[PDB]
Ligand binder design. Structure first.
Ligand SMILES: NC(=O)C1=CN([C@@H]2O[C@H](COP(=O)(O)OP(=O)(O)OC[C@H]3O[C@@H](n4cnc5c(N)ncnc54)[C@H](OP(=O)(O)O)[C@@H]3O)[C@@H](O)[C@H]2O)C=CC1
Ligand SMILES: NC(=O)C1=CN([C@@H]2O[C@H](COP(=O)(O)OP(=O)(O)OC[C@H]3O[C@@H](n4cnc5c(N)ncnc54)[C@H](OP(=O)(O)O)[C@@H]3O)[C@@H](O)[C@H]2O)C=CC1
Ligand SMILES: NC(=O)C1=CN([C@@H]2O[C@H](COP(=O)(O)OP(=O)(O)OC[C@H]3O[C@@H](n4cnc5c(N)ncnc54)[C@H](OP(=O)(O)O)[C@@H]3O)[C@@H](O)[C@H]2O)C=CC1
Ligand SMILES: NC(=O)C1=CN([C@@H]2O[C@H](COP(=O)(O)OP(=O)(O)OC[C@H]3O[C@@H](n4cnc5c(N)ncnc54)[C@H](OP(=O)(O)O)[C@@H]3O)[C@@H](O)[C@H]2O)C=CC1
Ligand SMILES: NC(=O)C1=CN([C@@H]2O[C@H](COP(=O)(O)OP(=O)(O)OC[C@H]3O[C@@H](n4cnc5c(N)ncnc54)[C@H](OP(=O)(O)O)[C@@H]3O)[C@@H](O)[C@H]2O)C=CC1
Ligand SMILES: NC(=O)C1=CN([C@@H]2O[C@H](COP(=O)(O)OP(=O)(O)OC[C@H]3O[C@@H](n4cnc5c(N)ncnc54)[C@H](OP(=O)(O)O)[C@@H]3O)[C@@H](O)[C@H]2O)C=CC1
Ligand SMILES: NC(=O)C1=CN([C@@H]2O[C@H](COP(=O)(O)OP(=O)(O)OC[C@H]3O[C@@H](n4cnc5c(N)ncnc54)[C@H](OP(=O)(O)O)[C@@H]3O)[C@@H](O)[C@H]2O)C=CC1
Ligand SMILES: NC(=O)C1=CN([C@@H]2O[C@H](COP(=O)(O)OP(=O)(O)OC[C@H]3O[C@@H](n4cnc5c(N)ncnc54)[C@H](OP(=O)(O)O)[C@@H]3O)[C@@H](O)[C@H]2O)C=CC1
Lengths: 330, 331, 331, 330
C-alpha cells in the first residue's frame, strides 16, 4: 500500500480512503466489519463516513457500525484516521432550523451525536459536508476551535466547496494562528472533471489534501453496462449512474470505455481508481466497496500502472476543462 | 445614463464601460476620438484600455490615441476614470524577453512608466492585471502596486482573467496589511460564455469587486453576425472568436435561434446582449466595444432597454448557464 | 550545585541535567532509583527521559521507572523539572504504523497520554520534540502543543535534534500569536562532535533557548574508554557512537591524546568532558548519562572543577571546533 | 539557455548568473565589456557585482565597468537583472565606524554610491554581502523599505548568511507585509558542500533562490593541475585554489577529478558548473569567466547532461554532509 502526506499537514494517509456510505443501506453490519478488517490488513488507515449515512430512519447507522467495529478492540481506533461530517439533516424533508448547515449551534449538537454513535472520544478529521453560504468563517472557526481545544477533534476538512471557499476559509484561519482546512473532499472522476477548474487548483495552492468521492461516479465506471445483462448492478442502478446511462451521449461514453478496456484486458473499476491516482494534487480516491471483493479490486487498482496509450485514450473519451481562467477565456 | 458603485468601493461608474481595443487596428484615430467624445456626452465616465492594444508592431497605439484625446483639454482627463493593464508582452510578437511580460515587480515598474508616457498623464485610475500570473506571489505584487499608490501613479488595482480563488487570495493578502485589494475583475462573460458564473463572479461578489464583462458580444457574434455574414469591411465579427464560432454548427445553431427570436420581438441582437448582462447579479456592466459612433449610440440605447420575463427565459433556453460551484457539478 | 535560567525563561535548572536513557536497558530499576535519589540529594532538579527509552520490547520502561520513583512520595514530583519526548516509534522494529511516530497532532495526542500514564503524573514540565519532523508544519505542531498547555498537561515545549533554522521558524511562528515558543534545544554537543556550533547553538542563543547537550561523553567515548578496553569496564562505550569512533584510526588517536593529556594533568576524562561543556557559551549544561551511582558522583565533582586555560587550549588543539556559519565554511 | 524562477518570486533568470568580480583586477575593461556582450547574446539576463569589486585602491571599478557598459545603449539596462551588494568597506584595513556592515547609515550611503557608479536609477537585486550580527532586522528592513518605496531597489537578497539568519530575516519581513529575501548567494561547489547542512535547506523552506559563488572554487575545479605550470594571470594560481593545491588531501581530490574527466572526455570547468545545476534548490552558479571563451565554456556547461556514473563518481571524490541534524547527529 502506498502512503502520502495529506496535503501540507503531518498526517500520513493511504492513497486509498475507505468510504463507508454503503455500510448499512447496501452492506450489512457483519460484512461491513469484514471489509474494514480487510482494509486495515491491506494497510488502509483512513476511513470516511458521515452522520447522515445509513439512510432514512437509519441516518447514523453507518457511524454506529464503525462504533461497533472499534468496540472489538485490537487497536482498531488507534490505527485509523477517522473522518466524518457535519451539515446534513439527520431527520427524514425540511429540517428544523439549525438542525442542518454549519451554524455553531448545529456544529455543537452534531459532533456530540457523532461521537456517541462512533463510541470514541475524538474525531480525527471533522468535515463540512457542503459549503454553507449563510455561516461566516469567524463563526465556523470559533466552533471548530472550541472542539480542537477540548480534544474532541484534531483536524478540519471541507467537502463540496468552491475553490474560493477554500481560500477564504484558510486565510481567515491563518489570521489568528488556526490550522485551516487540511483537505477537500470533492467529486472527481473520469465522467466529472470540473473540479479541475478551481477546486483542485485552490486546494493545491493552500496545501489541502484532495480526496475524491464517488470515484466510479456512483458505480457508472465499474463495468455497469456489462453488468446490466447479468443484473450485477446495485448502487450502479440508482442515482448518478442510472441517470447517466439513460442519456444517450453519456451511455456511449461508458460503452467506448468498457470496450477499450476489453481490448486492453483491464478491469473498468480499477482503471477509474488508478486514473485518479495519476491526477496532480489528488491524495487519492475514496473507494466505495459494497463487497470485500470490491475492496480487493480497489487494492489491486492501487498497484495498476496505466500506459500512456490508455491515459491518452481515456483523455479522448473523457476530456477535462483544466484550470480557470484558461478553461473558458485565455 | 445609469451609474453604480464599482463593487464595494467609493468610485462611481457608468454601467457601460467604453472599451478601446478597436481604437487603432480597427477604428482610426479620428473616429476613435469622436466615439470617446460621444461616450462622454452620453455620461460614460469609465474607459478601459491596455498597453498591448494596437496589436502587432503597433502595440501601445491605443494608449497614445487616448493620450492625444486627453491633450485636447476640455476636462477630459479629470472626467474619465482611466483604466489600463499590465502583463502583456510589449515587444516583437513571439516569446518575450524574461521579465518583459507577466507580473514581476520588475515588469510592473517598467510597464506602468511606459503606459503613463503614452497616455500622457501622471496617474492611472484603475491599473489592472491583464491575466493571473501563477509565478508571482501576492506579497511581491502588492509591494509593487503599493509603491505606485504611495507615489500617486495609480489609485485602484483591479484584476482580469483571474480564477475566483485568485481574487480571494489577492484580497485576503492585501487586507492582512491594511491595503485596498482588487476593486474589480474583468472577465469574459456574455450569453455564449457563462462559466464565469461558477466561481469568478461568486468570489467577486463575496469580496465586493466590481464585475466588468469583456467581449460582451463575444467579439461580434451576438451583434447580428449571421444576418451580416456575407457583408464585408473591417468587421470584428468576420474573424477571430466570432468567425470560428460560426463554423461550428452547434454554436451557429444557437445564434440562429437567437437572431430569429429577436426578429419575432423587434429587438436588436447587439442591444439585447448588452442589456442581458446588465441584468446579471453582481455585474457592474459590459465593456462595450463599438467600432463606430453609431455602435456606441446603440450601446447607450441597450442600457435603457428592459427585457421581458418572456425573452429572458427564452434566452436561458438557448444559452443555459452552469450556476455556481459546487452545485454546478456536484450537489 | 550551580543553577542557571533555562535560556530566556523563568525556569531555574541545575547545570547538570540527569539523563535516564540507561535506566532499564543498562541500569536496573533499583540502581536507577538510587541514582535519582542521589541526584536530588546533590541538588539536581532537572530530569530528561523519552517515551522510547527502555529499548525494543521494553520501550516505555524508563518512563515507568521514573513513575515508580515519583510514586515513592517525598516531594519528588514537585521538586523535579520533568522532561520527556515525542516523535519516536513505540513499536518494536521496522517502520511505524502511519502516525504512530513523527509529529502530527494525531501522534502528539496519543504519545502524551501514554507518557503521562507511564510517568504516573498529570503534567510534563518540558515536552520535547525528539527530532525535527520536516513533514509537519508549525501551525499544526503549535496547535497540538497549545491544546496541552491550556489543559494543563504540559508547561513548556522544547526541541531536540533541530537545525538552527527549525528553531527560528518554530519560535517566529509561535511569537506571531502570543505563544511561548521553544524554551530549549537538546542537541549533540561534546569535544568529539562540535558542529552544533555552526548554526544550532547560535540560533538557540539568538532566540533565547536553553542548550542541553546530549551524549556529553559521546556515548562514553570520552570517559576513559581506551583505558577501560584493557582493564575491562566498557558498557555503553562498547557500542554505538563510541565503538564506531574507535574503529576510525584518526578519531581513536584523538581519544588517545585526550587520555594521555589528562593522565599527565591528574584529571578524570569523563569529568573533563562535562566541565568543558560547562564553559561553552550558550550551553545550559550537559545531560549526564550515569550508569552507576559512582558515575553520578563523578559528574557532580566535574561541576565543581575549574579547567585551566592551559588545558582548555590543549583540548581545543585535539578537538578543533568549526565555529559559526558562514565563517565556518566561507568567510 | 535555460531560465527558472528565482525561488518563489515572479522574477525569471537565466540558470547561469554572470559574475563580474574578475572585471577590473583580473580581466581588463575591454574584455570585460566583451564578456558582457557575449553573456547577453547567449540569453544571460542576471549579473552579479558588488561595490567592493575592483579591489584595494580600485574598489568600485567593477561597478564603473558595468556603468559604462550600460551607457552603450542597446536596451542593456532594460534587459539585465542587475545585482550588487552592500556591507564591505569602500575606503583597506580598519573601516571607519558605519562605513562597513549593515547599519541603516551605511546602507543609505552605500546604495547611492553604487547607483552613481552603475549610472542607473535602480538596482534590481540589492544583496547583503554578509550577515551582520550587530544590526537587527527591524532596522535593516526599515532601511531597505525606504529604498523600495523610493524605487531605488526592487528585491532584497542575502549572501553569506546562516540558514537561521534567512529564517529570522524573512519571518521579520512577513510580519509586516514586506517581501523578504528573494535569494541567498552562498559558497557552494564540489569542494565545499557544507551549505547543504542548513543554508540551502533554509533557503528552500523560505522559497529563496540559491546562486552559488566561486562555483569552481576559485579555479581549483577548472583544470588547475593540468594548468599548474603555465603562467599568466590565472585566478587558479592564487587565493583559495593555490592554498588547496598545497594541501595533499585536497590536491589528490583534484587529481582524481581531473583524471576521471580525462577518461570520460569532459572539461573540468564545465562539469563543476553542470554539477551545481543538478543540486536541488540551486538556481544556478555565478560563473566567473576571466575570458570570453571561458564564458562560452560556461554556456556549454549549461547544456551538458551528466550521467549517473559520473554523478556517483563525483560524490565518491567530493562527499557532501547532507542536512543537519542528520549530518552530525541522527
Ligand atoms: N462528500 C460527499 O458529498 C460524498 C461522499 N462520499 C464518500 O465517498 C465514498 C465512495 O462514494 P461511492 O459513490 O460509494 O463510490 P463509487 O463511485 O466508486 O460507487 C460505489 C459502487 O461502485 C461499485 N464498485 C465499488 N467498487 C468497485 C470496484 N473495484 N470495481 C468495480 N465496481 C466497484 C459498487 O457498485 P454496485 O453497488 O452496483 O456493485 C459500489 O457500490 C463513499 O463511501 C463516501 O464515503 C460519496 C458520495 C457523496
Ligand atoms: N437528507 C440526506 O441526508 C440525503 C439526501 N439525499 C437525497 O437524494 C437526492 C440525490 O441523491 P441520490 O439520488 O440518492 O443518489 P446520487 O447518485 O444522485 O448521489 C449520490 C450521493 O451524492 C450526494 N448528494 C447528491 N445530491 C444530494 C443532495 N440534494 N443533497 C445532499 N446530498 C446529495 C449524496 O451523498 P452524501 O450523503 O455524501 O451527500 C448521495 O449519496 C437528493 O435529491 C437528496 O434529497 C441523498 C443522500 C443524503
Ligand atoms: N481583459 C481581457 O482579456 C480583454 C479585454 N477586452 C476589453 O473589452 C472591450 C470589448 O471587447 P470586444 O471584443 O471589442 O467587445 P464586443 O464583443 O462587444 O465587440 C466587438 C464587435 O461587436 C460589434 N458591436 C459592438 N457594439 C455593437 C452594438 N451596439 N450593436 C451591434 N453590434 C455591436 C462590433 O462588431 P462588428 O465590427 O463586426 O460590427 C464590434 O467591433 C474591449 O474594447 C477591451 O477594452 C476585450 C478582449 C479581452
Ligand atoms: N491577424 C490578426 O489576428 C489581427 C488582429 N487584430 C486585432 O486583434 C483583436 C482580435 O484578436 P484575435 O486573437 O485575432 O481574435 P480572438 O477573438 O481570438 O481574441 C479576442 C481577444 O481575446 C484576448 N485573447 C484571446 N486569446 C488570447 C491569447 N493567447 N493571449 C492573449 N490574449 C488573448 C485578446 O484580447 P486582449 O489583448 O485584451 O488579451 C483578443 O484581442 C482585434 O482587436 C483585432 O483588431 C488586428 C490586425 C490583425
Ligand atoms: N535527544 C537525543 O537524541 C538524545 C538524548 N540523550 C539524553 O542524554 C543523556 C546522556 O546521553 P548518554 O549517551 O548516556 O551520555 P554519555 O555521552 O555521557 O554516555 C554515558 C556513558 O558514559 C559513561 N560515563 C557516564 N558518566 C561517566 C563519568 N563521570 N565518568 C566516566 N564515564 C562516564 C558510562 O559509560 P559506560 O556504560 O561504558 O560505563 C555511560 O553509560 C541520556 O540519558 C538522554 O537523556 C542521549 C542520546 C540521544
Ligand atoms: N532509539 C534508537 O536507538 C534507534 C536506532 N535505530 C538504528 O540503530 C542505529 C543507532 O542505534 P544505537 O547503537 O543505539 O545508536 P548510537 O549508540 O550510535 O547513539 C546513541 C543514541 O543516539 C540516538 N539515535 C542514534 N541513531 C538513531 C536513530 N535512527 N533513530 C533514533 N535515535 C537514534 C539514540 O538515542 P535516542 O533514542 O534518544 O534518539 C541512541 O540511544 C542507527 O543507525 C538506527 O538504524 C533505529 C530506530 C531507533
Ligand atoms: N558573495 C561572495 O562572498 C562572493 C561573490 N562572488 C561572485 O561569484 C562570481 C564567481 O566567483 P569566482 O571565484 O570568480 O568563480 P570561479 O571559482 O568559477 O572562477 C574563478 C576562475 O575559474 C576559472 N574558470 C572560470 N570559468 C571557467 C570555465 N568555463 N572553464 C574552465 N575554467 C573556468 C577561471 O580561472 P583561471 O583564471 O585560473 O583560468 C576563473 O578566473 C564572482 O564574479 C562574484 O560575482 C565570488 C566570491 C565571493
Ligand atoms: N590578495 C591579492 O593578492 C590580490 C587579490 N585580487 C583580487 O582578490 C581575489 C583573490 O581572492 P583573495 O581575497 O586574495 O583570497 P580568496 O581566493 O580566498 O578569496 C576569494 C573571494 O572570497 C571572498 N572572501 C574570501 N575571504 C574573504 C574575507 N575575509 N573577507 C571578505 N571577503 C572574502 C572574496 O570575495 P568577496 O569580495 O565577494 O567577498 C574573494 O575575492 C581575486 O578576485 C583578485 O582579483 C587582486 C590583486 C591582489
Amino acid at each position: 500500500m502506498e502512503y502520502t502526506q495529506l496535503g501540507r499537514i503531518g498526517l500520513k494517509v493511504s492513497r486509498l480512503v475507505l468510504g463507508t456510505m454503503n455500510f448499512g443501506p447496501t452492506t450489512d453490519e457483519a460484512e461491513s466489519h469484514a471489509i474494514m478488517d480487510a482494509a486495515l490488513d491491506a494497510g488502509i488507515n483512513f476511513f470516511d463516513t458521515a452522520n447522515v449515512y445509513g439512510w432514512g430512519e437509519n441516518k447514523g447507522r453507518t457511524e454506529e457500525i464503525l462504533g461497533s467495529w472499534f468496540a472489538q478492540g485490537g487497536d482498531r481506533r488507534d490505527k485509523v484516521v477517522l473522518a466524518t461530517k457535519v451539515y446534513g439533516n439527520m431527520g427524514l424533508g425540511p429540517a428544523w432550523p439549525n438542525h442542518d448547515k454549519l451554524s455553531a449551534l448545529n456544529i455543537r449538537r452534531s459532533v456530540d451525536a457523532s461521537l456517541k454513535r462512533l463510541g470514541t472520544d475524538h474525531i480525527d478529521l471533522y468535515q463540512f459536508h457542503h459549503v454553507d453560504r449563510d455561516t461566516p468563517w469567524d463563526e465556523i472557526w470559533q466552533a471548530m476551535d472550541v472542539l480542537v481545544r477540548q480534544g474532541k477533534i484534531l483536524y478540519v476538512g471541507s467537502s463540496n466547496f468552491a475553490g474560493w471557499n477554500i481560500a477564504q476559509a484558510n486565510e481567515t484561519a491563518a489570521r489568528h494562528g488556526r490550522l485551516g482546512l487540511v483537505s477537500e473532499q470533492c467529486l472527481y472522476n473520469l465522467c466529472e472533471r470540473r473540479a479541475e477548474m478551481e477546486v483542485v487548483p485552490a486546494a493545491r495552492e493552500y496545501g489541502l489534501g484532495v480526496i475524491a468521492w464517488s470515484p466510479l461516479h456512483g458505480g457508472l465506471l465499474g463495468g455497469a453496462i456489462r453488468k446490466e445483462q447479468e443484473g450485477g448492478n446495485r448502487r450502479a442502478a440508482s442515482g448518478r449512474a442510472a441517470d447517466a446511462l439513460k442519456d444517450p451521449q453519456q451511455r456511449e461514453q461508458i460503452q467506448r470505455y468498457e470496450d477499450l478496456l476489453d481490448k486492453h484486458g483491464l478491469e473498468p473499476g480499477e482503471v477509474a481508481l488508478a486514473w485518479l491516482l495519476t491526477r496532480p494534487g489528488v491524495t487519492g480516491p475514496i473507494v466505495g466497496p459494497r463487497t470485500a471483493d470490491q475492496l480487493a479490486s480497489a487494492v489491486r487498482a492501487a498497484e495498476l500502472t496505466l500506459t500512456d496509450e490508455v491515459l491518452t485514450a481515456l483523455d479522448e473519451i473523457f476530456p477535462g476543462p483544466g484550470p480557470s481562467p484558461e478553461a473558458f477565456a485565455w
